[PDB]
Design a protein around this nucleic acid. Sequence first.
RNA 1: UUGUUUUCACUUUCUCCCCGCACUAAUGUGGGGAAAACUGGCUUUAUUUCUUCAAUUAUUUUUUUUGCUGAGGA
RNA 2: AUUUCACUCAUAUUAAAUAAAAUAACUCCAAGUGGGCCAUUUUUGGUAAGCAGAACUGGCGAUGAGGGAUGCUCCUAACGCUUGGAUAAGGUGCCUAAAUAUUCGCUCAUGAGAUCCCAUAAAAGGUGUUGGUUCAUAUGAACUAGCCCUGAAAAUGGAUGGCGCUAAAGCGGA
RNA 3: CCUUCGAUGUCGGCUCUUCCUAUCAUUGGGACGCAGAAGUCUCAAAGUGUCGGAUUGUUCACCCGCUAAUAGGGAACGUGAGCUGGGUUUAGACCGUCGUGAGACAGGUUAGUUUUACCCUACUGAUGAAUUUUAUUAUAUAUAUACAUAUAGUA
RNA 4: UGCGAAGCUAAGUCUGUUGGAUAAUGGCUGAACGCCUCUUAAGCCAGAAACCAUGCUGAUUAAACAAUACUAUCUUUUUUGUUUGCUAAUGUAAAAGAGAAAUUAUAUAUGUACCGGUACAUAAAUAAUCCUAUCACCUUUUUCGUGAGCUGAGCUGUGAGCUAGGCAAUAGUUCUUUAACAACAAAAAAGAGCACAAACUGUAGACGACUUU
Lengths: 125, 337, 185, 201
Amino acid sequence: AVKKVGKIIKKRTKKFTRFQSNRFMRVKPAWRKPRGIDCRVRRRYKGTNLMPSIGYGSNKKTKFLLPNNKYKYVVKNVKEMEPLIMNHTKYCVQIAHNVSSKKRKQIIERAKQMNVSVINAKARL
Amino acid sequence: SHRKFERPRHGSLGFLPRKRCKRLRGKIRSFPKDDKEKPPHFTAFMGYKAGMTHIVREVDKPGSKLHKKEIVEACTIIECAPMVVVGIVGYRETPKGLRILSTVWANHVSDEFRRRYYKNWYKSEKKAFTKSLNVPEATKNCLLKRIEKYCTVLRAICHTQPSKTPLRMKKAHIMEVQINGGSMKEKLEFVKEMLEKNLPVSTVFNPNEMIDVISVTKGHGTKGVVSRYGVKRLPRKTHRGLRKVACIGAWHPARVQFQIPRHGQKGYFHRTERNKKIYRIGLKTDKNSASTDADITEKKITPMGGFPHYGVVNEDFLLLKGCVAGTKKRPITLRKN
Amino acid sequence: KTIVSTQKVLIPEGVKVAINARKVTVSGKYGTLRRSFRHLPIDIRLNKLKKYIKVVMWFGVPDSLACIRTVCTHLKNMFTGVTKKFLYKMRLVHAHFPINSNIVDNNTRIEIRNYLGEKSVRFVKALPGVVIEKSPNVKDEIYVSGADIENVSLTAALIHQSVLCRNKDIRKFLDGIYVSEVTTV
Amino acid sequence: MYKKEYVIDCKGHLLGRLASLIAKELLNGQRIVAVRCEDINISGSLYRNKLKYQEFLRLRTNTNPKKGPLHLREPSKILWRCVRGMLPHKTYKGQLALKKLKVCVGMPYPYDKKKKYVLPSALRAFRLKKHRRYCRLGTLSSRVGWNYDTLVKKNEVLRKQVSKAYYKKKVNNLNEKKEIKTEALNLINPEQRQVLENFGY
RNA sequence: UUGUUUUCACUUUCUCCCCGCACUAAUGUGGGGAAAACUGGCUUUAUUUCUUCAAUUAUUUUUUUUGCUGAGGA
RNA sequence: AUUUCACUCAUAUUAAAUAAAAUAACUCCAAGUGGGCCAUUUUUGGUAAGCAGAACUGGCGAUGAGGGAUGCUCCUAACGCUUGGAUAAGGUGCCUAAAUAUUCGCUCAUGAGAUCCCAUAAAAGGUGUUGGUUCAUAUGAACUAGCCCUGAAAAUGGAUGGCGCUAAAGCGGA
RNA sequence: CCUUCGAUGUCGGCUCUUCCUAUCAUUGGGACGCAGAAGUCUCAAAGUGUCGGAUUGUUCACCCGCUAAUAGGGAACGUGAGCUGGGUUUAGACCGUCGUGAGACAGGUUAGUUUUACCCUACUGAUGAAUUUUAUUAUAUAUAUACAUAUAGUA
RNA sequence: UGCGAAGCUAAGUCUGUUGGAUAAUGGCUGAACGCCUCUUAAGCCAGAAACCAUGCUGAUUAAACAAUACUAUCUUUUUUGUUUGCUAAUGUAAAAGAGAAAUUAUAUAUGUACCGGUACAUAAAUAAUCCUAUCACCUUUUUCGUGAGCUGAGCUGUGAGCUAGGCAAUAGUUCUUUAACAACAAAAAAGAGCACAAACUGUAGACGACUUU
């Protein structure tokens, strides 16, 4: 069903799974459109693995923003934080996975004094 | 398509499943219908198959090829030491069948009877039936009065005395014999006056009387279809053996029917044969049990050397015309017609 | 579908009747008859001081209307039977083998022998309230009497049907017991 | 529908209509107990219904009749099977609805002492024209092989006697209570009296 | 080659008479006759709150209790 | 006949009406396809066929959804993701959401009957019952057509979808 | 020619079971051009039973004989991981006819490998726990209670 | 090679019911249709190797159940709680007055009184009804019923009531009204044997299982 928090409405949860991936190990759950001929899912038989459509698209006014109602931006050092100084209340910052504890403390403190929220603030400590 | 040549099926479907019987003891499925007019009387008895012999009798069948001539007939000997009556059970009719109201025991029961309640009597404390028997007589009379008022079928618990037989078994075979006769008032007193004393066979049965026999047939383990159902042997050229049923069903239904003979257990089946005539009720006391007025010899029923695989019959017995199901030492329940 | 249809039955002198919920009871000098009509939709108006009973049906289709006269005739048969016993005279006819009839059990359970020389006893038990005897005038006659027309007639039919011949030309082997006449006492 | 359980007297009730009403109640989560199931009526002649049951009886699985349609002969079981056939018994909810039903022949110990209800929408007197044949489920079951009809009749006449005694005692108690009321009604205040007789108490 | 006119036959009785005279489904009844005129119908005068002023259609104006929804941010 | 000059033939609703008529016209390059099948209507061969061969249109293929219990082709209706409302086809005794609704008839079946496709039934009969028509002094006839009945027999056990239903939950209406 | 040619083992017999009724006999009836006897027509009825052999691979058939009767059928033309392999239907060979020939024959003849179950289910027998949101045709000194009752092991 | 007990075995021996309701058919009474008619109306009868019972076989085919015999620390009230794999501990297919025992007939029933009948009452929108709820507390005057203990009987308690008096509720507008039933844990008070295995058997048997000592 639809999920609605604040103004952000997510039109569908529980991401689509590939047909028959439940009962075949070689078939990964990642969605693939089934070509088939008599394919059930392709023909849209009721009660079987509905396919993604453009109609599920979230509205463009609130498309990419996180539950904190702002867009995420992934940074790798303190230098890539400069553009956030202007839109600190529209963007949250996430530190890249391959950033060391050297630099993570620096990015955390810089974002703190920049007044921009950090997503994975308590990582690697 | 149809069979080229029809012939009746093999074996009776009425004795299915040909599985092993639950118990070694013959169990009466139903007792004869109650007749109010007749006086109260017992209906069944228990004995043991001692073996068989043959007798000579003069036929009195006019217009028959035998008539006045003397005939040899096979006869089964069933040793019947007196049974002991120990209990009364009352039944009442409900739309769900017969319901026990209660059972009333006698003041004393034999150790032979109590053994039947134990799997390991030798190591047991033998505490069964030890403190339920000294109940006050007032409650006894109350239970009998309620049985009189409400019950409509009366049976007496009675047990055999294997110690009087050559059996290795020591625990008694116990069973309920239904009392058929007058009203419950008379039935209750008829059983109460016999609530502890011995029950001889002569009380239950008379000579020259037709009775039914209930017993478990002789066991044979698992047997092939040829022996078990009497199917015809396949020709000698058959590839994977000839002692089997060739076709065990048509293509459809795509199953094997339950009417198809198959290998399995043979023997040790419960059976109830009708119309066995009592030829003589031999008594323990007399020494001429096997003597006739045309023989006047001094001899008892036991053949010289003893009954094979059984022993010596030192108690009451009845000479039954024909054969009866079961091996030697098998408990046979005799039922009134 | 007619609105109301009635028919009237006179009550004879020596009879006393009682009708409750179309359950009629008739009493006379020859016994008592008791009949139930609860399988028909009818009002039974019993008038005692002026005799007669009227059977009236409302909204009767012809199939149901056919039963009014049936009920009335049943009632008048009850009256006649209770005032003068219904009598069925039967005749025993035989070609070569005389039929030996024996009446036992205080005029019930007649037994028949020598039917076609079969020397096997046949017998019929009279229905309740029915008496079988032999006529004192004609030697091959049987009287079946009683208050209930249905009972006596059924008993006579039982006598007749107990003695049918088998595997022979029925129109040549005429022997048997036949209802010669039906009257009253 | 809103009681802990409904005890209904099946005497003089048409089998199919009664089963339909019972099934709807059970599906709505109402526990019912059907008593005197051997007095259920069925439209159509006794011979016709006997023929129908013989056709049912002739029906068994050829391979192994143990698995076949268990035929059942008690009128209570017949009513139970009719209700089951009127019910989605192969689902969990349908199974619960089926098990919420109890059927008896006669009136046993708990149910002979509680109020029995009647469904007028299924009464023979209201649903069958008086000139058309009907059957009695008890006699049908007896002809099919129930062989417990007469015993139920005996138990029923005994229950009739005890119920008659109870009813006489209850009538005496109600009469004496009404006599108490008509006199104690003069001892209350007059305006209380006026209210009571105005509203018919 | 259309109108126009004429005749009898049409109702209620808890009315009466005769016959069956209690015969009815009936606290009545079947058949045959008389009676006026409550009943029913019509014609006048006054009224429509004693009572009715309907229904359908066209044309208009409201009303009780309530379900769901709130895009946008000029 | 062509050419050039004149004059002028509704257009303000548009030389008849209507038109999400330019979503047109044209050009280029190229894919797949070139075994079809079904329904209504028509039709050829055939005794007939879920047979063979054709015509029109619509479908199935290539297509799901509601209904027809079930069903590639029938009825409704064609499809982004939702919230309400109201319906179509079809239904409202239970299975199963909604009427044991209302109103008027018919029918009793000892193998009743019960939604197009659709899942078979005929000639011939009936003194079953219901309603009409035409002849003869409340009777006798002869017709007629509704429901019912006979005609009506097959193989695992059995199917109005099941239960069941007769003051219908059947048939024909409103 | 709708399904099966990346194979559904294609004749008959033997064996074994079940089903239908359009009933051959047996059961009880009705009709007769029915005296009896025998028989014919027909109804309800599928409970019971429907055989031994000679010839032929045969089904079919036809005789001998018994019988009460020797009825008709279905089940993938029931039944080949049940058999057999006589026939048909590979390769050898013979004859006749046909063909120039290689060869052909819905002509005859003779000889010619018949594979696998230990899986699932079905069926036949053989052990066997667990079973409270479960059960109750009562239980209580002419008398109350389901608002109750019921533990478990052994026998 | 003879004979060959025991055991298996047939070619040997023994045993293999009667009731109900019906079909076909033949009938009874009897209208429709003044007569007649087995009913092709209502209401009945007799009736078959068929049907259903009876009888027989299974019944872990009913995941079924009863009575009996003996036994396992066990059995009854109150308070607090169930907010190394474990060693305290909770679940509801349905509480919010979940209220209700005569029987029966449907072209009628039921009670009473007499001898199925007569007479009289009652009931006939029957649950469209009846019954049950709120009067707190404490104090005074008291009235009437039931339990412990005492000796048909006195007293205490309990339930209902009578006269008179003053005495409380308050959480800011509702977020289920935490209200039922059953169970369990801890702590207090009172009362309260068998089976398998083993050896043997052989009426049993592939192994289990079964019969025994």
